[PDB]
Design a protein around this ligand. Structure first.
Ligand SMILES: CCCCCCCCCCCCCCCCCC(=O)OC[C@H](COP(=O)([O-])OCC(O)COP(=O)([O-])OC[C@@H](COC(=O)CCCCCCCCCCCCCCCCC)OC(=O)CCCCCCCCCCCCCCCCC)OC(=O)CCCCCCCCCCCCCCCCC
Ligand SMILES: COC1=C(OC)C(=O)C(C/C=C(\C)CC/C=C(/C)CC/C=C(\C)CC/C=C(/C)CC/C=C(\C)CC/C=C(\C)CC/C=C(/C)CC/C=C(/C)CC/C=C(\C)CCC=C(C)C)=C(C)C1=O
Ligand SMILES: CCCCCCCCCCCCCCCCCC(=O)OC[C@H](COP(=O)([O-])OCC[N+](C)(C)C)OC(=O)CCCCCCCCCCCCCCCCC
Ligand SMILES: CCCCCCCCCCCCCCCCCC(=O)OC[C@H](COP(=O)([O-])OCC[N+](C)(C)C)OC(=O)CCCCCCCCCCCCCCCCC
Ligand SMILES: CCCCCCCCCCCCCCCCC[C@@H](O)O[C@H](CO[C@H](O)CCCCCCCCCCCCCCC)COP(=O)(O)OCC[N+](C)(C)C
Ligand SMILES: CCCCCCCCCCCCCCCCC[C@@H](O)O[C@H](CO[C@H](O)CCCCCCCCCCCCCCC)COP(=O)(O)OCC[N+](C)(C)C
Ligand SMILES: CCCCCCCCCCCCCCCCC[C@@H](O)O[C@H](CO[C@H](O)CCCCCCCCCCCCCCC)COP(=O)(O)OCC[N+](C)(C)C
Ligand SMILES: CCCCCCCC/C=C/CCCCCCCC(=O)OC[C@H](COP(=O)(O)OCCN)OC(=O)CCCCCCC/C=C/CCCCCCCC
Ligand SMILES: CCCCCCCC/C=C\CCCCCCCC(=O)OC[C@H](COP(=O)(O)OCCN)OC(=O)CCCCCCC/C=C\CCCCCCCC
Ligand SMILES: CCCCCCCC/C=C\CCCCCCCC(=O)O[C@H](COC(=O)CCCCCCC/C=C/CCCCCCCC)COP(=O)(O)OCCN
Ligand SMILES: CCCCCCCCCCCCCCCCCC(=O)OC[C@H](COP(=O)(O)OCCN)OC(=O)CCCCCCCCCCCCCCCCC
Ligand code: SF4
Lengths: 156, 318, 174, 71, 115, 98, 70, 105, 83
């Protein structure tokens, strides 16, 4: 149908922009954030793909939870996630962010950042290499490529 | 046809702003041993389009503590004045030919000051307030120094008309004539446009996005467009003021090519400086102009008052 | 006609009504900036481009300091806006109503105030037919501050230097 | 040359304004056509509305604002 | 006229960009999203409290120096007069008095910020 | 007199009435005082430009100079009052009585 | 390599060409193939108004000459 | 009250700016230079009382040139009468007043 | 002279900006009173004809006033032509 074709093209265009312009919030917790710096480094330059760190959560699209999430830190992470406007995505990085990690059976560690925020991508490793994190970012981009919001709305 | 001329002045400026964003990305990357955006399009040519679409399709939010009226007006004022600053520029023919073309630019810059102040105050947050007051101090210093420097340089010209600037620089360059004022003017234009090392109103390392901390999506993109348009406009003003291009009335496109090349060189120098230097402290910026530039600016103003009189080289009034 | 100067004068009075109703120094400075720009427009239409640009630039610089001072000295928990307070809104509405009544009476008939007599006709009518040539009369008169007006320059410079000394002495404390 | 042209143009505009005033203010009880507002008989320059008073808005606007609005 | 049309065009374009920004995207606002940002933790006080200005004297001196630049601006036309000696004397007098003001404030420590 | 002069004089009168009617802040009254001089500047330049009084064109600039000198004086007094009391409220200026 | 920056700079330069060239072409189009008349002073404005008056078509850029005086 | 130091010492501090018929730059004339000259030459040397009593004609002409009140009254009267006449169709403006003419150069 | 030399050496090592500023200001104050082209600038400003040269009524006793612009009497700008 003409309307179906129009909405398909429009949300192909919309998903392309969001996929190609990703702005992670400048947010790192532990040793996993060093591999974020090495992904930002010249070797695996993240700025090629349109992935740029922004300090303010208002101007951020993705939250890369890279490090251990503690009980004393969970409210701040939830606060910045809430203050991030939509559409927003979450990439947990490393064992600590995925589940508990080396500190799973601890009194002061949250066993998974997905207990706090909805996580879109999980990156495995301790720490995941910069290439592993880049693969996770590209996988997030491909996940964005498949979103059909206007197509869902047209048939709604 | 005047509306067509307005559109032909506005739309290419916005396109050049977007591609200046791209160029700054790539230049900083290559100076930092990276490549910069080269994935979104061929050599990363669709990156500005992707960024604009993402920003204008993302949700904007007004903070619960904000004053909504001045929260919305500030990006409007910033972008409106950034676009308005271009109308008296002769390239080689101004869109609007003014008798006092420089005082209009000074007044419009001083008005464009208030966009960041009102956005910082309206946001109702401590980082925004700090950014606004840093803007206040920066504007104080750069405003006084810029006013006196422009007075001297135009005193070498004879009037406040930029076409008269072209006629003055028909033979040699104001950079050859008055290079110390040119250096101080370049520093003052950096401060006016809030570029490194004077990017203190929005200092990421110290403040979390500074005055535009609460701004997101479309309103933020307007602040970015206003900043980059101001960068290009100030570099164009510097090129017209100090690097005068030869003008042929029957083929004016040559002046356009020369002027565009000089403006691009100055803008790339801006990006180069940002890549090279650290950031000032705003008290040190105030002490830089007041305690160093201001005495030398006054001495050079006296010298450029005296010089045409003692050498019988006073420019024509018209 | 096009009543450009009259419309600008009305906007000037509206900005005055605002910053005189005095919501809070932020919005008072906003209204004063608007009034300065509109007065620049008025005197540009009347002929003085240098004077209009100068008053606009001077008041833009002056309201910058006022903003920094009201952020530090003249701020409260809930800064007042025109609709926030009953007194401020009352003064604002009173000024607007008085201005509208004066404008309506002046447009409908030759309104004679208790102080002055005002005729409802063209600001273009009141102008002069003659013209200057190859120079600006306003620019020449202003530039005459140095050839003529040596005394004015002396007293003005002395006043500015004494003002610097004074502001240093007032804020000395101790 | 321009001074002579300006004088002739001003005098012609004043004369045709006077003719139209004679046509218009004919039934007015107490009205003298062409009466001066000055005690002196010395020539006084027309102000702006003595020339472009009974003329079109385009002409009036051009005469009163064309130079200032030309940019 | 032309300048008014240009200003109206620029303001209309900026307002249209704002209107597109606030109506085109999908909106979803709640209390936590619109709360003030203080790096993840609730602000202790309010942003409308007094904010000490340690360069208060420099702002007043800036007002006076803005007056000085306003006085100095008509110099390009003033240099077209026949009384060049008087004009030069007055211009140098104004600039020397401005320099004296700057030197006096500098020596009396008015350019230093409050601690 | 045209209606432009009426509007400028009305603006001066409004700014004068604002100054004479304090609310709480001294800064607001300082802003009202600054507006009166803006109206004076506009009126003076409208009068001078209309009568082609060429040598009088320098008067409005001197007017602005002494305007901002008065503004500087008011700001200095305001900072001293604010240091003394914590607020720029005119209610605290009540130690002296008539 | 560093020459991959050039296409973006080329696009920016091409964008910056449009305003000035467009203004020049529009001025030549609306002034009869000649430069737009600069009137910084009342003398020049009066010259333009006289050109409008003597043209007979209400366009100052329509210039007349010896064939018009005789 | 008034210590005429300028007159005593032969100085000129503000008398150059007191009136609009004095020496102006580039010999730019005032709007009412002739009327001010006539009034000043009438009132010179006779004092304020006699100047107000006897030079009232010159002063009235000067004020009329300055403010243009009688001229505006005449113009408004003519405009009102013309508008009333054209309201009832009793007056037809000439083509040269309607914009269908070739003015003088 | 020794004290002056020591002061200049110390200032040039501590405040070169201020030394340059004061030197430029002093040269701006002093040089115009010595240059022989100040009077040339005054003459060039005088020679500029902003307004119309209203002619004088000939009384028959004006030998220094030209009858035609190209007559030898009257001011000459031959000095300005070769300058
Ligand atoms: C050349 C310019 C000439 C101007 C001439 C006229 C002005 C003269 C000088 C000023 C004096 C009058 C000022 C206006 C007073 C209006 C009444 C009032 O109290 O308004 C409160 C309002 C602030 O209220 P608020 O605290 O933000 O609202 C929170 C409420 O409590 C709760 O509100 P809410 O949360 O329910 O929100 C609902 C609504 C609230 O809407 C409003 O408050 C309407 C504000 C506009 C006035 C409408 C009447 O918000 C919106 O609709 C959102 C969009 C707002 C953005 C658009 C604003 C357009 C302004 C024009 O004050 C203003 O808007 C002040 C600015 C007015 C001037 C605008 C133009 C400024 C230009 C600056 C640069 C100039 C350069 C050239 C010189
Ligand atoms: C907190 O712990 C920490 C971390 O965390 C865990 C860290 O990581 C690090 C490590 C730190 C680093 C690695 C440093 C940061 C990394 C970097 C790479 C720094 C480099 C920074 C930059 C390169 C700056 C880039 C920033 C931004 C925001 C660029 C984004 C671009 C924009 C916002 C521009 C968008 C706006 C645009 C494009 C405007 C254009 C829009 C328009 C609408 C214009 C078009 C208008 C028109 C009218 C055109 C229409 C015309 C048409 C249709 C016709 C034209 C004709 C045709 C033919 C088409 C540290 C130290 C740390 O301590
Ligand atoms: C306030 C805005 C309205 C008034 C401004 C003036 C308009 C009429 C001007 C008439 C005279 C004229 O055209 O002069 C030509 C002159 C240019 O020519 P000129 O001054 O060289 O001389 C006229 C030309 N000749 C030499 C031929 C006589 O225009 C200017 O000088 C520019 C004046 C700009 C005034 C700007 C005031 C502030 C406005 C800022 C608005 C920003 C956005 C605000 C809203 C944002 C939030 C929503
Ligand atoms: C104030 C500005 C005035 C001038 C505007 C000039 C044109 C502006 C051009 C820019 C438009 C920017 C938005 C682009 C489109 C995307 C957003 C969009 O579609 O928004 C539309 C909005 C969309 O509503 P929304 O609030 O759901 O918007 C969110 C939209 N999505 C989901 C896409 C994010 O439409 C409406 O608000 C109205 C919908 C129909 C209901 C009509 C109610 C009655 C009132 C209006 C109809 C006329 C009544 C006549 C009779 C009156 C008397 C009884
Ligand atoms: C700037 C001012 C606003 C502009 C308004 C819009 C103007 C036109 C917008 C420009 C559209 C650009 C489209 C770019 C196409 C993407 C190129 C191509 O590579 O994309 C492919 C296809 O993309 C998607 O299938 C759809 C892309 C968009 C399709 C076009 C939709 C219609 C656009 C034209 C209509 C514009 C007018 C209507 C809106 C105003 C998939 O690539 P991708 O997998 O990701 O790359 C992975 C990286 N690799 C290769 C290294 C691995
Ligand atoms: C004066 C200067 C004005 C601005 C100039 C801007 C220049 C920007 C640079 C333009 C270079 C664009 C080159 C083309 C890029 C995309 C090419 C291709 O790879 O993408 C296509 C996608 O293209 C889109 O579908 C439509 C074209 C959109 C891209 C061209 C954009 C042109 C410029 C955009 C407007 C610029 C101004 C914006 C305002 C293919 O996607 P698709 O075919 O589906 O995928 C399925 C293929 N299968 C079937 C084999 C698997
Ligand atoms: C010395 C007396 C001390 C006791 C009294 C103190 C009073 C204050 C100090 C007053 C000193 C100045 C008084 C003399 C003013 C001169 C005014 C004018 O007549 O002289 C000018 C000559 O000026 C000279 O160049 C020197 C002027 C003075 C230079 C500055 C010295 C004053 C410094 C004051 C310091 C601040 C103290 C003042 C406030 C207390 C005019 O020259 P000219 O070119 O023909 O004018 C052209 C006009 N045309 C076009 C019609 C022909
Ligand atoms: C038009 C294009 C111009 C291009 C020029 C660009 C230059 C390179 C750009 C990179 C610099 C940009 C970032 C740098 C920002 C900071 C710059 C800076 O610091 O300079 C100020 C610098 C720092 O001072 P401090 O080290 O803090 O010492 C304080 C002592 N108490 O000091 C200055 O003010 C330098 C001022 C330069 C003015 C030029 C000097 C004048 C030379 C005098 C000779 C001319 C005399 C004229 C009379 C001639 C008579 C015949
Ligand atoms: C017919 C109405 C056309 C659109 C008028 C919009 C005015 C309005 O009421 O919305 C205010 C809206 C913000 O509303 P929020 O409180 O953030 O939440 C709702 C988000 N849509 O403000 C705007 O959209 C900016 C208005 C454009 C500025 C134009 C002023 C000149
Ligand atoms: C007099 C004719 C010139 C007219 C005015 C000149 C133009 C304007 C210059 C005046 C502006 C203000 C000057 C202020 C002077 C005193 C300021 C001061 O306090 O300086 C001190 C004192 O330092 C000094 O050394 C005083 C300056 C001495 C320089 C004066 C030398 C005079 C030179 C005369 C000509 C010599 C020619 C040499 C040529 C060399 C090559 C150019 C240092 O400041 P700090 O507090 O230490 O900095 C902050 C630290 N936290
Ligand atoms: C040649 C003639 C012209 C040809 C092209 C014509 C169209 C051009 C584009 C016009 C502007 C967009 C028009 C509206 C697009 C559809 C929007 C829509 O219907 O969105 C509905 C839906 C909302 O969500 P829903 O599924 O309803 O579920 C409720 C959520 N719990 O889903 C959403 O809201 C999804 C979120 C995004 C919606 C906004 C973006 C839509 C696409 C805009 C593309 C252009 C962007 C331009 C930006 C400004 C310029 C830079
Ligand atoms: S997963 Fe490993 S590398 Fe990452 S934060 Fe935990 S301990 Fe550090």
């Amino acid at each position: 149908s003409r309307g179906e074709y129009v909405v398909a093209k429009l949300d192909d265009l919309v998903n392309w922009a969001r996929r190609s312009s990703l702005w992670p919030m400048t947010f790192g917790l532990a040793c996993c954030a060093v591999e974020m710096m090495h992904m930002a480094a010249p070797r695996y330059d993240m700025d090629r793909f349109g992935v740029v760190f922004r300090a303010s959560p208002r101007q951020s699209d993705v939250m890369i939870v890279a490090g251990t999430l503690t009980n004393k830190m969970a409210p701040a992470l939830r606060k910045v996630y809430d203050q991030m406007p939509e559409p927003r995505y979450v990439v947990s990085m490393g064992s600590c962010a995925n589940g508990g990690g080396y500190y799973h059976y601890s009194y002061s560690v949250v066993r998974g950042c997905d207990r706090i925020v909805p996580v879109d991508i999980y990156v495995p490793g301790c720490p995941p290499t910069a290439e592993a994190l880049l693969y996770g970012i590209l996988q997030l981009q491909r996940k964005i490529k498949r979103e059909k919001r206007l197509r869902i709305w047209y048939r709604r | 046809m005047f509306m067509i001329n307005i559109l032909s002045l506005i739309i290419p400026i916005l396109l050049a702003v977007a591609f200046l964003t791209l160029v700054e990305r790539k230049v900083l990357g290559y100076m930092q041993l990276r490549k910069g955006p080269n994935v979104v399009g061929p050599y990363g040519l669709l990156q500005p389009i992707a960024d604009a679409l993402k920003l204008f399709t993302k949700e904007p939010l007004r903070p619960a503590t904000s004053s909504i009226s001045m929260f919305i007006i500030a990006p409007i004022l910033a972008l409106s004045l950034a676009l308005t600053m271009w109308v008296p520029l002769p390239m080689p023919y101004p869109l609007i030919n003014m008798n006092l073309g420089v005082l209009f630019m000074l007044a419009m810059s001083s008005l464009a000051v208030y966009s960041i102040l009102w956005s910082g105050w309206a946001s109702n947050s401590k980082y925004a307030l700090i950014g606004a007051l840093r803007a206040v101090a920066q504007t104080i210093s750069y405003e006084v120094t810029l006013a006196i420097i422009l007075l001297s340089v135009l005193l070498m010209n004879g009037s406040y008309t930029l076409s008269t600037l072209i006629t003055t620089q028909e033979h040699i360059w104001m950079i050859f004539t008055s290079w110390p004022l040119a250096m101080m003017w370049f520093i003052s234009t950096l401060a006016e446009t809030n570029r490194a090392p004077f990017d203190l109103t929005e200092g990421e390392s110290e403040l979390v996005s500074g005055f535009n901390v609460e701004y997101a999506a479309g309103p933020f993109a307007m602040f970015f467009m206003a900043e980059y348009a101001n960068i290009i406009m100030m570099n164009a003003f510097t090129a017209i003021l100090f690097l005068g291009a030869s003008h042929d009335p029957h083929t004016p496109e040559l002046y356009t090519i020369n002027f565009v090349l000089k403006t691009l060189a100055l803008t790339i120098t801006f990006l180069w400086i940002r890549a090279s230097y650290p950031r000032f402290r705003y008290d040190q910026l105030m002490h830089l102009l007041w305690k160093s530039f201001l005495p030398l600016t006054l001495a050079l103003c006296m010298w450029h008052i005296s010089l045409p009189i003692m050498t019988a080289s006073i420019p024509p009034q018209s | 006609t096009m009543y450009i100067a009259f419309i600008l004068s009305t906007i000037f009075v509206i900005g005055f009504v605002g910053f005189s109703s005095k919501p809070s120094p932020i919005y008072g400075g906003l209204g004063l900036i608007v009034s300065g720009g509109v007065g620049c427009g008025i005197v540009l239409n009347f002929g003085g481009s240098f004077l209009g640009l100068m008053v606009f630039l001077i008041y833009l610089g002056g309201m910058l300091v006022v903003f920094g001072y009201t952020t530090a000295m003249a701020t409260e928990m809930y800064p007042e806006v025109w609709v926030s307070n009953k007194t401020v809104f009352g003064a604002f509405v009173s000024g607007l109503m008085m201005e509208f009544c004066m404008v309506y009476y002046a447009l409908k008939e030759e309104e004679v105030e208790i102080i002055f007599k005002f005729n409802g006709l063209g600001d273009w009518v009141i102008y002069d037919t003659g013209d200057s040539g190859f120079f600006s009369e306003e620019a020449m008169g202003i530039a005459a501050l140095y050839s003529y007006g040596t005394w004015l320059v002396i007293v003005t410079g002395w006043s500015l230097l004494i003002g610097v000394v004074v502001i240093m002495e007032i804020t000395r404390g101790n | 040359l321009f001074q002579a042209e300006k004088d002739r143009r001003v005098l012609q505009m004043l004369r045709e304004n006077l003719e139209e005033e004679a046509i218009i203010m004919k039934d007015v009880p107490d009205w003298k056509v062409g009466e001066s507002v000055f005690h002196t008989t010395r020539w006084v320059t027309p102000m702006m509305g003595e020339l472009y008073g009974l003329r079109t808005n385009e002409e009036i606007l051009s005469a009163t604002y064309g130079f200032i609005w030309y940019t | 006229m032309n300048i008014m049309l240009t200003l109206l065009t620029n303001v209309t374009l900026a307002s249209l960009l704002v209107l597109i920004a606030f109506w085109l995207p999908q909106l979803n606002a709640y209390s936590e999203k619109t709360s003030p940002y203080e790096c993840g933790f609730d602000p202790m006080g309010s942003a409308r409290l007094p904010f000490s200005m340690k360069f208060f004297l420099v702002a007043i001196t800036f007002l006076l120096f803005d007056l000085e630049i306003a006085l100095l601006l008509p110099l390009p036309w003033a240099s077209q007069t026949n009384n060049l000696k008087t004009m030069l004397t007055m211009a140098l007098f104004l600039l020397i008095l401005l320099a004296a003001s700057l030197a006096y404030e500098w020596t009396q420590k008015g350019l230093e910020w409050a601690e | 007199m045209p209606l432009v002069y009426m509007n400028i004089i009305m603006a001066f009168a409004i700014a004068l009435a604002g100054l004479l009617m304090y609310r709480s802040h001294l800064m607001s009254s300082l802003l009202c005082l600054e507006g009166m001089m803006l109206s004076l500047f506009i009126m003076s330049t409208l009068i001078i430009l209309n009568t082609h009084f060429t040598l009088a064109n320098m008067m409005p600039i001197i007017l602005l100079v002494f305007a901002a000198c008065e503004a500087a004086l008011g700001l200095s007094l305001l900072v001293m009052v604010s240091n003394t009391y914590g607020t720029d409220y005119v209610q605290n200026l009540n130690l002296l009585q008539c | 390599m560093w020459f991959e920056i050039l296409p973006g700079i080329a696009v920016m330069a091409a964008c910056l060409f449009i305003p000035g060239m467009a203004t020049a072409h529009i001025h030549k189009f609306t002034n009869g193939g000649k430069e737009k008349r600069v009137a910084h002073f009342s003398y020049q404005w009066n010259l333009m108004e006289r050109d409008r008056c003597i043209s007979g078509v209400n366009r100052y850029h329509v210039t007349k000459g010896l064939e018009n005086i005789d | 009250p008034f210590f005429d130091v300028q007159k005593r010492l032969g100085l000129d501090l503000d008398r150059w700016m007191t009136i609009q018929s004095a020496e102006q730059p580039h010999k730019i004339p005032g709007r009412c230079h002739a009327f001010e000259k006539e009034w000043i030459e009438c009132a010179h040397g006779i004092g304020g009382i006699r100047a107000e009593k006897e030079c009232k004609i010159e002063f009235d002409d000067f004020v009329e040139c300055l403010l243009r009140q009688k001229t505006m009254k005449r113009l408004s009267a003519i405009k009102r009468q013309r508008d009333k006449l054209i309201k009832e169709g009793k007056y037809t403006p000439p083509p040269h007043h309607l914009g269908k003419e070739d003015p003088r150069p | 002279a020794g004290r002056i030399a020591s002061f200049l050496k110390n200032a040039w090592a501590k405040e070169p900006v201020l030394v340059a500023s004061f030197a430029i200001g002093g040269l701006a104050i002093i040089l115009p009173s010595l240059s022989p082209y100040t009077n040339y600038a005054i003459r060039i400003n005088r020679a500029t004809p902003y307004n119309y040269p209203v002619p004088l009524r000939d009384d028959g006793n004006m030998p220094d006033v030209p009858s035609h612009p190209q007559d030898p009497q009257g001011p000459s700008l031959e000095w300005l032509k070769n300058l």
